[PDB]
Protein backbone atom coordinates (compact mmCIF):
# COMPACT_ATOMS: atom_id res chain seq x y z
CA UNK A 1 0.00 0.00 0.00
CA UNK A 2 1.73 3.09 -1.26
CA UNK A 3 0.86 6.71 -1.11
CA UNK A 4 -2.78 7.36 -0.20
CA UNK A 5 -3.97 10.97 -0.38
CA UNK A 6 -7.63 11.99 -0.09
CA UNK A 7 -9.07 14.43 -2.61
CA UNK A 8 -12.54 16.09 -2.72
CA UNK A 9 -14.03 18.89 -4.88
CA UNK A 10 -16.89 21.13 -3.77
CA UNK A 11 -18.93 23.03 -6.33
CA UNK A 12 -20.98 26.08 -5.43
CA UNK A 13 -21.17 24.88 -1.82
CA UNK A 14 -23.98 22.60 -3.06
CA UNK A 15 -22.35 19.60 -4.72
CA UNK A 16 -19.60 17.58 -3.09
CA UNK A 17 -17.58 15.28 -5.32
CA UNK A 18 -16.04 13.10 -2.62
CA UNK A 19 -13.55 10.28 -2.57
CA UNK A 20 -11.88 11.32 -5.88
CA UNK A 21 -8.38 10.28 -4.76
CA UNK A 22 -6.39 7.71 -6.66
CA UNK A 23 -6.45 4.40 -4.75
CA UNK A 24 -2.70 4.86 -4.50
CA UNK A 25 -0.12 7.17 -6.02
CA UNK A 26 1.26 10.67 -5.47
CA UNK A 27 -1.24 12.43 -7.77
CA UNK A 28 -4.89 13.62 -7.69
CA UNK A 29 -7.10 15.03 -10.40
CA UNK A 30 -10.51 14.95 -12.08
CA UNK A 31 -11.98 15.61 -15.48
CA UNK A 32 -15.38 17.34 -15.47
CA UNK A 33 -17.87 17.78 -18.26
CA UNK A 34 -20.07 20.80 -17.49
CA UNK A 35 -23.29 21.28 -19.43
CA UNK A 36 -24.99 24.63 -18.85
CA UNK A 37 -27.39 27.15 -20.31
CA UNK A 38 -27.77 29.61 -17.42
CA UNK A 39 -24.60 29.60 -15.23
CA UNK A 40 -22.23 32.36 -15.95
CA UNK A 41 -19.69 30.79 -13.53
CA UNK A 42 -18.97 27.98 -11.13
CA UNK A 43 -17.12 28.26 -7.83
CA UNK A 44 -14.79 25.36 -6.97
CA UNK A 45 -12.99 24.39 -3.79
CA UNK A 46 -10.38 21.64 -4.22
CA UNK A 47 -9.46 19.87 -0.95
CA UNK A 48 -6.36 17.70 -0.51
CA UNK A 49 -5.67 15.70 2.73
CA UNK A 50 -2.09 14.59 2.03
CA UNK A 51 -0.40 11.34 2.99
CA UNK A 52 2.96 12.62 4.39
CA UNK A 53 4.52 9.16 4.77
CA UNK A 54 6.74 9.37 1.61
CA UNK A 55 6.40 12.78 -0.01
CA UNK A 56 8.64 15.83 0.44
CA UNK A 57 6.03 18.31 -0.62
CA UNK A 58 2.37 18.41 -1.60
CA UNK A 59 1.83 18.79 -5.38
CA UNK A 60 -0.27 21.81 -6.29
CA UNK A 61 -3.14 21.87 -8.85
CA UNK A 62 -3.34 23.04 -12.43
CA UNK A 63 -6.74 23.82 -13.94
CA UNK A 64 -7.85 24.29 -17.58
CA UNK A 65 -11.38 24.88 -18.90
CA UNK A 66 -11.77 23.91 -22.59
CA UNK A 67 -7.91 24.09 -22.63
CA UNK A 68 -7.74 27.74 -21.44
CA UNK A 69 -5.63 28.28 -18.28
CA UNK A 70 -7.66 29.12 -15.16
CA UNK A 71 -6.48 31.11 -12.10
CA UNK A 72 -6.09 28.88 -9.05
CA UNK A 73 -5.71 30.30 -5.50
CA UNK A 74 -4.17 28.44 -2.57
CA UNK A 75 -6.36 29.34 0.44
CA UNK A 76 -5.08 26.89 3.10
CA UNK A 77 -1.80 25.01 3.42
CA UNK A 78 -1.38 22.88 6.53
CA UNK A 79 -0.19 19.41 7.48
CA UNK A 80 -3.70 17.94 7.51
CA UNK A 81 -5.17 19.82 4.51
CA UNK A 82 -4.22 21.90 1.52
CA UNK A 83 -7.03 23.81 -0.13
CA UNK A 84 -7.32 25.58 -3.53
CA UNK A 85 -10.14 27.60 -5.08
CA UNK A 86 -11.10 28.74 -8.62
CA UNK A 87 -14.12 30.43 -10.12
CA UNK A 88 -14.55 29.21 -13.68
CA UNK A 89 -16.54 31.23 -16.23
CA UNK A 90 -18.50 29.34 -18.88
CA UNK A 91 -18.51 30.60 -22.47
CA UNK A 92 -20.04 27.56 -24.19
CA UNK A 93 -22.81 25.10 -23.40
CA UNK A 94 -20.23 22.30 -22.93
CA UNK A 95 -16.99 22.86 -21.03
CA UNK A 96 -14.36 20.26 -20.21
CA UNK A 97 -12.47 21.08 -17.04
CA UNK A 98 -9.10 19.36 -16.34
CA UNK A 99 -7.97 19.55 -12.73
CA UNK A 100 -4.66 17.82 -11.87
CA UNK A 101 -1.38 17.60 -9.96
CA UNK A 102 0.31 16.10 -13.09
CA UNK A 103 -0.91 15.39 -16.61
CA UNK A 104 1.36 12.74 -18.06
CA UNK A 105 1.64 8.97 -18.67
CA UNK A 106 -2.08 8.38 -19.27
CA UNK A 107 -3.25 9.75 -15.89
CA UNK A 108 -6.43 11.13 -17.43
CA UNK A 109 -7.02 8.06 -19.62
CA UNK A 110 -6.70 5.40 -16.92
CA UNK A 111 -6.43 7.02 -13.46
CA UNK A 112 -8.32 10.22 -12.71
CA UNK A 113 -12.13 10.01 -12.63
CA UNK A 114 -14.38 11.62 -15.19
CA UNK A 115 -17.59 13.17 -13.89
CA UNK A 116 -20.43 14.86 -15.76
CA UNK A 117 -22.36 17.78 -14.22
CA UNK A 118 -25.41 18.72 -16.22
CA UNK A 119 -26.57 22.01 -14.68
CA UNK A 120 -29.62 22.11 -16.93
CA UNK A 121 -31.18 18.79 -15.91
CA UNK A 122 -29.38 18.76 -12.57
CA UNK A 123 -27.99 15.33 -13.33
CA UNK A 124 -24.55 14.73 -11.72
CA UNK A 125 -22.97 11.39 -12.61
CA UNK A 126 -19.72 9.48 -12.75
CA UNK A 127 -18.79 8.72 -16.37
CA UNK A 128 -15.54 6.80 -15.57
CA UNK A 129 -14.25 5.86 -12.10
CA UNK A 130 -10.87 4.84 -13.52
CA UNK A 131 -8.55 4.38 -10.51
CA UNK A 132 -10.84 5.98 -7.89
CA UNK A 133 -14.29 5.46 -6.35
CA UNK A 134 -16.09 8.80 -6.47
CA UNK A 135 -19.13 9.53 -4.32
CA UNK A 136 -21.31 12.38 -5.46
CA UNK A 137 -23.12 14.08 -2.57
CA UNK A 138 -25.92 16.52 -3.35
CA UNK A 139 -26.88 18.44 -1.38
CA UNK A 140 -23.58 18.58 0.32
CA UNK A 141 -23.45 17.80 3.97
CA UNK A 142 -20.67 19.76 5.57
CA UNK A 143 -18.58 17.36 7.67
CA UNK A 144 -15.75 19.89 8.14
CA UNK A 145 -15.99 23.66 8.49
CA UNK A 146 -13.80 24.06 5.39
CA UNK A 147 -16.42 22.22 3.27
CA UNK A 148 -19.18 24.76 3.62
CA UNK A 149 -19.19 27.65 1.03
User: What resolution, expressed in A, was reported for this entry?
Assistant: 2.0
List the domain range (segments joined by +) for residue 54. 1-149
> What is the Cα 77 distance to its own chain's centre?
17
Report the structure determination method.
Answer: X-ray
**Cα 132 from Cα 39, distance rounded (Å):** 28
**Cα 138 from Cα 15, distance rounded (Å):** 5
**Cα 13 from Cα 127, distance rounded (Å):** 22
**Cα 32 from Cα 85, distance rounded (Å):** 16
| Count of the separate structural domains present in the chain | 1
Amino acid sequence: MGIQHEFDIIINGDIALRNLQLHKGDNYGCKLKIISNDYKKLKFRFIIRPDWSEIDEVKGLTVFANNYAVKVNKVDDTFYYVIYEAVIHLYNKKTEILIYSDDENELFKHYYPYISLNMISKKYKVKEENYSSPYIEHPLIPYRDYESM
